[PDB]
Amino acid sequence: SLKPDNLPVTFGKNDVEIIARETLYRGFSSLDLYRFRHRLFNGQMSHEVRREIFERGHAAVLLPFDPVRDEVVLIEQIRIAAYDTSETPWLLEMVAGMIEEGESVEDVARREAIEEAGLIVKRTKPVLSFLASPGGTSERSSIMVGEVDATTASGIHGNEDIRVHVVSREQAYQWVEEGKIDNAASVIALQWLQLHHQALKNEW
Amino acid sequence: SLKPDNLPVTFGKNDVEIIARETLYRGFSSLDLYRFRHRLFNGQMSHEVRREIFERGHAAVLLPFDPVRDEVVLIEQIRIAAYDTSETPWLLEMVAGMIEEGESVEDVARREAIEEAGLIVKRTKPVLSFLASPGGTSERSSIMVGEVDATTASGIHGNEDIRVHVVSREQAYQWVEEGKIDNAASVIALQWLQLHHQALKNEW
């Protein structure tokens, strides 16, 4: 295991001055206007830049995977924001929830697998961590895979209302390829699993 | 090629009533409060649900891939929204831009590969299309891979300021595994490539 080099990005936090964050909205979550100047590639300083950034905490994401049965547990809940681009706003997702307090991502991954899927997790691994849409929100989501008994996954759970589904991994991945699953975190988790299932099954 | 079944999601748009979308903010883009009622799994109707949803159009995403050299072109630009969770807000990304007017995603993929990378694209394929963070924004991003001559990828391009990088695919994917690339669209494109490079190289 050899980590990679620092390169080829060299501009860091010493190359940016956040002039100010201007609160544009304060409800359940926030729109804030980042006002900033940054170094440019040609060595010159920038004009002041104004960026509207949706701010609303960060998420833990569990991929419930049963290594014995080679199955995944998906969850189903409505995402109203999906309405305008999707046939249905009910989406097939991974266990996930926002991180708060002194919670680690393991804390929240595990907590949410009970709240949303009634699922007790065994061994866990870190998968990947990703920024959802950096152009327009600071949200970071951190994904863990969790060893789960898929035979215990049933029922409705949860203003949250969630249904539980058990499919084989291969079916979960085909639904990615073919567009049935298409939320960022499921696609990332389920492509990650497809590149790793054999080594993971072997290890577990 | 056999598409999948309709199941197991059955609730559709006939099961939701958007009561109203209440504009909470109007600048470069919008925060709107979706007010809605929806069917619940146990057959009962919901209380009124209020969801704050960042609204700002949708994106096309190009993965510039050179099948001869087995290389990828990445771009580098600052994402200020990444500041709080990342060592550097300068990020290594895919060519991308917002969709407008009567633009198809091909139009925008191609347009942006010139604006951001000076790149002329040859053959294109659809990869995947995904919702960035459905919990908190309606943004959909649609990814195409594009046959590109990596030897023509150089320089600064672009309030946009973008640098261009040519790495081998394997290096691009290792940077995903190890966390150097971690924006949703790059991770999805670059895991997709890793599952498909051989068939794509063979076809092209």
Q: Which residues of B touch A36 (CB under 8 A)?
A: 80
Look-up: residue for tokens 């929830």?
A97
Kindly identify which residue of chain B lies nearest to residue A74, measuring between CA atoms. Answer: B8
**A31 to B46: CB separation less than 8 angstroms, yes or no:** no
Residues pairing with B27 in the sheet: none
Q: Which of B87, B137, B159 sits opposite A136 (nearest CB)?
A: B137
CB within 8 Å of B46: residues ≥ 6 apart: A159, A161, B37, B38, B39, B40
Cα of A63 vs its chain's centroid, Å: 10
The DSSP secondary structure of chain B, one letter per residue, reads --PPPS-S----GGGEEEEEEEEEEESSSEEEEEEEEEB-TTSPBPPPEEEEEEE---EEEEEEEETTTTEEEEEEEE-GGGGGGSS-SEEEE-EEEE--TT--HHHHHHHHHHHTT-PPP-SEEEEEEEES-TTTB--EEEEEEEE--GGG--SEE----EEEEEEEHHHHHHHHHTTSS-BHHHHHHHHHHHHHHHHHHHH-
What is the rounded distance in angstroms from the CA atom of residue B177 to the CA atom of residue B175? 6
Are the CB atoms for A124 and A145 separated by under 8 Å?
Answer: yes
Q: DSSP secondary-structure letter at A185?
A: H
Q: DSSP secondary-structure letter at A77?
A: E
Write the CATH number for A15: 3.90.79.10
Cis-peptide into B8, omega within 30 deg: yes
Tallying the residues shown for chain A, one arrives at 204
Q: Which residues of A touch B4 (CB under 8 A)?
A: 174-175, 178, 180
Q: Which of B81, B90, B135 sits opposite A9 (nearest CB)?
A: B90
Are the CB atoms for A55 and A27 separated by under 8 Å?
Answer: no
Domain assignment of residue A27, given as a range: 1-204
Q: Which of A4, A161, A179 sits opposite B174 (nearest CB)?
A: A4
CB within 8 Å of A203: residues ≥ 6 apart: none
CB within 8 Å of B171: residues ≥ 6 apart: none
Q: Which of residues 119-158 of B touch A (CB under 8 A)?
A: 128-141, 156
The CA angle B71-B75-B77, to the nearest 5 degrees, is 165
| Per-residue buried b or exposed e for B5-37, using 16+ beta carbons within 10 Å of the residue's own CB | eeeebebeeebbebeebeebbeeebbbbbbbbe
Among the listed residues A184, A182, A101, A176, the one whose alpha carbon sits nearest the alpha carbon of residue A140: A184
Counting the structural domains of chain B, the total is 1
The answer, for B23 touching chain A at a CB cutoff of 8 Å, is no
Which secondary structure element, helix H or strand E, spans residue A189, and what is its range? Answer: helix A184-203
Tokens representing A198 are: 């054999």
**B136 to A56: CB separation less than 8 angstroms, yes or no:** yes
Residues pairing with B61 in the sheet: B96, B143
**A78 to B29: CB separation less than 8 angstroms, yes or no:** no
The CA angle B43-B45-B47, to the nearest 5 degrees, is 145
CB within 8 Å of A121: residues ≥ 6 apart: A62, A64, A109, A110, A113, A146, A147, A148
Mutate to test the interface with B, among A3, A42, A50, A54 (most CBs of B within 10 A): A54
